[PDB]
């Protein structure tokens, strides 16, 4: 009666939840994800699952992934690299082994224009470099690491590394970036956005965010311009 609504920028990743209460008992028989632009108009399968084999299809072939453990009645969908064309209604239908069906509220996906992708910081100031996937379901992001590389660099540098299975008291930030890099996102809410505290001329370069939902990685890239005033 009221569609959860989800706004994401072109190119970003969305995770669209679909869980019947997670139990240690697989009751999920089938999982179907349908896409529609409006009503009054045909739908197409993003992805359908049955008997421990999922079929990503259509334009979503390369970009759609069944992320939820279906053996735990979690049939959540992860749509990568969202286009404007993907703007519409997404509907999850799970058929239970007891033969009842569970339809989840269709979710309106509103696709916004492309992120800036070109950041301009002023020396000796703080800036933010944001990176996050958006989902109706929390705590799906299993790992986040930011890699820095000046166009010159035949090399990579860890800006900030944070993982679900950390045997540390905090995120890992190496070298130069120590003491300055800091997390502005709530990774539990699938938000890996970071903050750079006291920017120096040498910080200039390309920052790459690799944000993981299991094995599945989504990658962003931000060019940082530093300026002396």
């Amino acid at each position, epitope marked *: 009666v009221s569609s959860p609504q989800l706004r994401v920028h072109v190119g970003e990743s969305v995770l669209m939840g679909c869980v019947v209460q*997670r*139990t240690e008992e697989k009751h999920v028989d089938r999982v179907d994800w349908l896409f529609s632009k409006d009503k009054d108009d045909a739908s197409e399968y993003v992805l359908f699952y049955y008997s421990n084999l999922s079929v990503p299809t259509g334009r979503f072939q390369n970009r759609s992934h069944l992320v939820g453990d279906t053996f735990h009645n979690d049939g959540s969908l992860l749509l990568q690299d969202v286009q404007k064309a993907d703007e519409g209604i997404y509907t999850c239908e799970i058929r239970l082994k007891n033969e009842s069906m569970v339809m989840k509220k269709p979710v309106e996906l509103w696709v916004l224009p492309e992120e800036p992708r070109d950041l301009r910081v002023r020396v000796g100031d703080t800036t933010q470099m944001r990176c996050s996937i958006q989902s109706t379901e929390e*705590k799906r992001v299993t790992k986040v690491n930011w890699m820095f590389s000046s166009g010159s660099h035949t090399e990579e540098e860890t800006v900030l590394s944070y993982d*679900s*299975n950390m045997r*540390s*008291g905090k995120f890992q930030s190496l070298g130069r970036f120590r003491n300055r890099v800091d*997390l502005t996102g709530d990774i*539990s809410r699938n938000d890996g956005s970071i903050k750079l505290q006291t920017v120096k001329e040498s910080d200039q370069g390309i920052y790459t965010c690799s944000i993981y939902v299991g094995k599945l990685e989504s990658r962003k890239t931000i060019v940082l311009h530093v300026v002396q005033d």
Partner: antibody
């Protein structure tokens, strides 16, 4: 319905061996490490050890070599085993999920008296 | 090993309450707070120094500076009357460590 529920004997004599079991429902142990934490009547929370998602284990220095944590992924079951039961092994025993750098989800806990 | 924590902290209804948590170089590592009531399992109320799970009341907030964390219970209710343990990570040994614990009593 993500749940941790512990289970085992409520009463034990000294010099016996405790063995608890924590049943992690709604998820898989293959990608989350589970903690064991206890709380003695008077005192606070004491971390005993962890079994990481990868099956690796670390323990509490004080609890050195009479604590033992293993698991069975097939059952989604994480076990604790305590040796040389003395007094004030008497405590509430909790198993908790390890998310990033904290304990997001906890068990209901289990009271375990060690008495003659 | 335990992080220093005041035994008891009182507070009238609606009053502000502040629970401190001290540790060596505590502010180079995340600190988290748990709530525990009568014969109940602990519940995470604050995590990562300064964040809050949905389901926890807005009037909870945390900070971590000068090697001293502080759980703030603004606008204290009677349902906040509980035991609060901070928690962290010892990077000498490789272990997770809790605080001594604080009993928050709600007066008025």
């Amino acid at each position: 319905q993500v749940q941790l529920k512990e289970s085992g004997p409520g009463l034990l004599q000294p010099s016996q061996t405790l063995s608890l079991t924590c049943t992690v429902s709604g998820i898989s142990l293959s990608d989350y490490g589970v903690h064991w934490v206890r709380q003695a009547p008077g005192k606070g929370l004491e971390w005993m050890g962890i079994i990481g998602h990868a099956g690796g284990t670390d323990y509490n220095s004080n609890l050195k070599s009479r604590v033992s944590i293993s698991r069975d992924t097939s059952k989604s079951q994480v076990f604790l085993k305590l040796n040389s039961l003395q007094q004030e092994d008497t405590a509430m025993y909790f198993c908790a999920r390890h998310f990033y750098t904290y304990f997001d989800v906890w068990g209901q806990g289990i009271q375990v008296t060690v008495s003659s | 090993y335990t992080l220093t924590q005041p035994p008891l902290v009182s507070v009238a209804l609606g009053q502000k309450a502040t629970i401190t948590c001290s540790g060596d170089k505590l502010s180079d590592v995340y600190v988290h707070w748990y709530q525990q009531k009568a014969g109940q399992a602990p519940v995470l109320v604050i995590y990562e120094d300064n964040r809050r799970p949905s389901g926890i009341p807005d009037h909870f907030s945390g900070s971590n500076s000068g090697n001293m964390a502080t759980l703030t219970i603004s606008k204290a209710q009677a349902g906040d009357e509980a035991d609060y343990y901070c928690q962290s990570w010892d990077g000498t040994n490789s272990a997770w460590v809790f605080g001594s614990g604080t009993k928050v009593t709600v007066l008025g």
